[PDB]
Write an enzyme that holds these catalytic residues in place. Structure first.
Site, mmCIF file in Angstrom:
data_model
loop_
_atom_site.group_PDB
_atom_site.id
_atom_site.type_symbol
_atom_site.label_atom_id
_atom_site.label_comp_id
_atom_site.label_asym_id
_atom_site.label_seq_id
_atom_site.Cartn_x
_atom_site.Cartn_y
_atom_site.Cartn_z
ATOM 1 N N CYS A 87 1.003 -1.087 0.022
ATOM 2 C CA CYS A 87 0.007 -0.132 -0.044
ATOM 3 C C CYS A 87 0.873 1.125 -0.013
ATOM 4 O O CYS A 87 1.560 1.586 1.178
ATOM 5 C CB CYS A 87 -0.899 0.013 1.097
ATOM 6 S SG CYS A 87 -2.018 1.623 1.111
HETATM 7 C C1 LIG Z 1 -2.604 8.501 0.817
HETATM 8 O O1 LIG Z 1 -2.867 8.007 -0.471
HETATM 9 C C2 LIG Z 1 -2.887 6.665 -0.640
HETATM 10 C C3 LIG Z 1 -2.572 5.870 -2.011
HETATM 11 C C4 LIG Z 1 -2.777 4.297 -2.137
HETATM 12 C C5 LIG Z 1 -3.229 3.821 -1.114
HETATM 13 N N1 LIG Z 1 -3.372 2.766 -1.263
HETATM 14 C C6 LIG Z 1 -3.284 1.556 -0.266
HETATM 15 N N2 LIG Z 1 -3.393 0.523 -0.889
HETATM 16 N N3 LIG Z 1 -3.716 0.590 -1.964
HETATM 17 N N4 LIG Z 1 -3.762 1.819 -2.226
HETATM 18 C C7 LIG Z 1 -3.482 4.637 0.255
HETATM 19 C C8 LIG Z 1 -3.602 5.821 0.369
#
Ligand SMILES: COc1ccc(-n2cnnn2)cc1
Length: 153
Positions: A87
């Site tokens: 993530c």
């Molecule tokens: C803060 O911006 C974000 C961007 C991507 C995610 N992700 C987490 N897991 N997949 N995408 C979470 C927050």
């Protein structure tokens, strides 16, 4: 697409000759979009002395979609699940993510390296690990060191 191939050729040259410290990325066999990478456990982190392997798949629409990257070595971390999913903003397109064609394989591998040193507990994939990191950091560090010893050394 020939633009994609010429871009991937340049990136592989730059990854071979100017790799970021702690980072190695290579073509697995004969396909420029089937890559692997290796990130060395960071100094003064519970992953130190660990060696972490990743799979780096380049999608058809690259550079307009981000590389698809997952850990192959298990790692104990708030933002990485038990299947190695990551993530991280730069691995997702806007509006939620921050990928743009100005970034590249080396940039996002470096971003992953930094994520290993500095978890983002606000966006966890492992809720319990994340709570542990936030509220019982000594137990997190010990569990991360033990996971590293069992799986990355
Ligand atoms: C803060 O911006 C974000 C961007 C991507 C995610 N992700 C987490 N897991 N997949 N995408 C979470 C927050």
């Amino acid at each position: 697409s020939m633009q994609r191939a010429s871009r991937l050729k340049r990136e592989l040259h730059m990854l071979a000759t100017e790799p970021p410290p702690g980072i190695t990325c290579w073509q697995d066999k004969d396909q420029m979009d089937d890559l692997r990478a290796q990130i060395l456990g960071g100094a003064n982190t519970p992953y130190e002395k660990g060696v972490f392997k990743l799979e780096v798949i380049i999608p058809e629409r690259y550079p307009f979609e981000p590389p698809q990257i997952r850990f192959l070595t298990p790692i104990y971390h708030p933002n990485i699940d038990s299947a190695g999913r990551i993530c991280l903003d730069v691995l997702k397109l806007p509006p939620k993510g921050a990928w743009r064609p100005s970034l590249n394989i080396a940039t996002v591998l470096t971003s992953i390296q930094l994520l290993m040193s500095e978890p983002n507990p606000d966006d966890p994939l492992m809720a319990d690990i994340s709570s542990e990191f936030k509220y019982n950091k000594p137990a997190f560090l010990k569990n991360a060191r033990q996971w590293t010893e069992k799986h990355a050394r």
